[PDB]
Amino acid sequence: MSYDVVIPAAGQGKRMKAGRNKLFIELKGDPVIIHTLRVFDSHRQCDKIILVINEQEREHFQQLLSDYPFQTSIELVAGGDERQHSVYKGLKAVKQEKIVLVHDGARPFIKHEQIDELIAEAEQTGAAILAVPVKDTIKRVQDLQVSETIERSSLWAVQTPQAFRLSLLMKAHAEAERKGFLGTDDASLVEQMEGGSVRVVEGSYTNIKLTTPDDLTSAEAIMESESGNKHV
């Protein structure tokens, strides 16, 4: 069906002084967050965007959003420094049982076709995530000494959005909060529940999270190239 999207500003790279959020860095003249918002704004099935921010940057986000036209409702919600608490505070803003997406503010390259595929999986089974196969060797390391190599065959690097039935994800967040469980992503909270199962939709290697100057460099090139002929 249609969905609400919760976009945390938290957990999107290192914490910057108020007003110098990494989400405000311009990419081809527009802040990273504007790029990301546009994807959901232009998507027919997105009913509402819930942008969860630090209260000390409310004036900045308000000003920024007043400078661009949107055709989708955007709610600014004050959240914590922790991505997980912020996401849960956003979820609490969702007004009815529906499919909800949680999407990193610093992932502007998500495509509508991946969003539709996700939503279809989540309707069906309750929880779906975008991910890509791991290509590098992964090791666990303690004080720069290798402990083990993680068997690679079935490893996937997880992205966002992540799509869920609202009630299922609210429950996951409630239980994790009660237990003091911190997960790195939303799916991990659902995986900790008794019933919990999470489906995977394969995404694109260009759905990068922008947290460093080097990521911005790659981002500029992805945008420049998206215009054109695509090599396979």
Place this chain on the structure above:
Amino acid sequence: MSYDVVIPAAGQGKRMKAGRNKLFIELKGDPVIIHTLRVFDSHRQCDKIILVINEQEREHFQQLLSDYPFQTSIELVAGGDERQHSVYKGLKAVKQEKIVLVHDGARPFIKHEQIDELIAEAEQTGAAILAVPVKDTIKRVQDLQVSETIERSSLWAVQTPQAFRLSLLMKAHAEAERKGFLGTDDASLVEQMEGGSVRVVEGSYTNIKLTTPDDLTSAEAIMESESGNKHV
């Protein structure tokens, strides 16, 4: 101090028809492999480059190497299709006990400083690899269903070069081959030996492996940017 480097052509992108190897793709006008070779050619401590190729591409690599002048000995060794066995064939070409590096031909962005740190660690303790911390959530997946989230805190994504005392790496490759053990990197073969141990040198996120057209897009941007200013 001084070293030989073994560069497998194998495992550096999907199989292409003879003569159309992914290593031959021009990046800013020069094949990817030429960029990689230049790093070692220009590094004072590199004694020899052992380039392990498919025999069906001998003529192309010969022609490539006639077209570019180098100030470092380069030996073409016919290897197999598998990276691990190819690397072992190259190691068998190293003439005496010394530090040896094994480096992906599709990783052109390695810097001399990082090579120097690797060598120093390998001289010290036997085995060292370049790696960077994992930033994404990593999950194991079966039939597109999540099985588990891999605990993230100590996970590193491994790159090359990987540096070793020759004797140690040869023993590791011999032991692995003797029992049919297949590892995804060289370090994994040392880790599989009784009492084998591997140290990590933290690298750079720009040391990407170029296997797809999207990778080439990123590579162009890294090259364009590395003449310039850089944010921390």
